[PDB]
Amino acid sequence: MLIAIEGVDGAGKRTLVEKLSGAFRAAGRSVATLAFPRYGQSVAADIAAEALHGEHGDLASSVYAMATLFALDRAGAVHTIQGLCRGYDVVILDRYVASNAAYSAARLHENAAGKAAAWVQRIEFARLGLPKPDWQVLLAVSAELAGERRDNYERDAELQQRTGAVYAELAAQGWGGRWLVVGADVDPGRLAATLA
Amino acid sequence: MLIAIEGVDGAGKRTLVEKLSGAFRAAGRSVATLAFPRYGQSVAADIAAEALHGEHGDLASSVYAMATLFALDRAGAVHTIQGLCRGYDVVILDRYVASNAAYSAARLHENAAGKAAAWVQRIEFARLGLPKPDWQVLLAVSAELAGERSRGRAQRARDNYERDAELQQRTGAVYAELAAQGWGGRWLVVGADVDPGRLAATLA
Ligand SMILES: Cc1cn([C@H]2C[C@H](O)[C@@H](COP(=O)(O)O)O2)c(=O)[nH]c1=O
Ligand SMILES: Cc1cn([C@H]2C[C@H](O)[C@@H](COP(=O)(O)O)O2)c(=O)[nH]c1=O
Ligand SMILES: [Mg+2]
């Protein structure tokens, strides 16, 4: 089973990955985790990270350019993902393909049913071969709470809010597959039971 | 012996590659050729090509984004190149790193002294460890004639770089500066009527 944990910056994804992993383990299942972007493991990820901090000229000014970089980072992880899927009962990803759909659409002021979100699906799942997640878990957070709890994306308050809005719609519309929306207080045991 | 052939679109680089290949094989040296972008062998290359034709939204609007894709395409070729440099006396590349420096600078209205060319240097050679070419051969041709070739060899489609006559002229000018200053190593500037056999003896 492949599970992707999604959310805006400051959502608390790392902590949820930890709790959920612990719940599946207590339930008698092996669990492996992987986080994106894979900083320090792929040039694409590192260049994207640098671009978000002002490096590489006009690269970050392009929505599709940035999305392509994150997608190429994931492309180089296909072999790893397939390996984990063959060796573990549950593979939990901290950010996956939906991240690209949400942030790209938000930057273009588009919605979940927009062009960028559709493009992400056509490119990553079909052309790059990224496995579709069985479940995409959105750790939803309001803009106010997020704004409460420094690259180009992090500093852009408007972008974060719009990205949260796109995510909420990607989840409701079942983009890429089935979604579940949870809070940072979700009970690990019940969530794991629901995602079993 | 790593040899890279450079030049604007429609310069006739393919034709020169062949001639140089045969000439080298005559002198008793084995040769392998590889062209960039590696269409069909790299997703980075295929997306770059489609982007040059208007696909993928605003991708092509970013000069550095396009340079990066071509740079990533080559990075995924580092092992294939090293390999060739192992199984053949001479390796001839149709376009290489200098192509990125020339077009990027040209798109930004910069020259060999601009940030873009220096950027391509750091990223491709200093960071991605792409093998420095022994020789970079600039096939200098008439801008009018090169543009006509592209138009003809397609109208019988042209991408965004090919249809930009001013871009092609500037790219030709940047190339001359790169060759003149020995950017990335030693260069050799030749014409369309260059004698194959003589060129080979010169290079090797
Ligand atoms: C993995 C991924 C991240 N991003 C973003 C969201 C973050 O602001 C930034 C780096 O992610 P991070 O904060 O989880 O390390 O890049 C995308 O836009 N698309 C993607 O596919
Ligand atoms: C290989 C390469 C090509 N280009 C260009 C020049 C061409 O107009 C276009 C596609 O190359 P092509 O005419 O050899 O098929 O992309 C770059 O800008 N950087 C590169 O590194
Ligand atoms: Mg061409």
Swiss-Prot record, chain B:
The record marks R153 as: Transition state stabilizer. ATP binds at G7, V8, D9, G10, A11, G12, K13, R14. Binds 1 Mg(2+) ion per subunit. This ion is required for catalysis, binding to the active site transiently (at the TMP-binding site), and probably acting as a clamp between the phosphoryl donor and acceptor. Disulfide bonds: none annotated. SUPFAM superfamilies: P-loop containing nucleoside triphosphate hydrolases. Residues 147-156 are annotated as: LID. GO terms for cellular component: cytosol. Pathway: Pyrimidine metabolism; dTTP biosynthesis. HAMAP family: Thymidylate_kinase (MF_00165). Homodimer. NCBIfam families: PRK07933.1. Belongs to the thymidylate kinase family. This is Thymidylate kinase. It comes from Mycobacterium tuberculosis (strain CDC 1551 / Oshkosh).
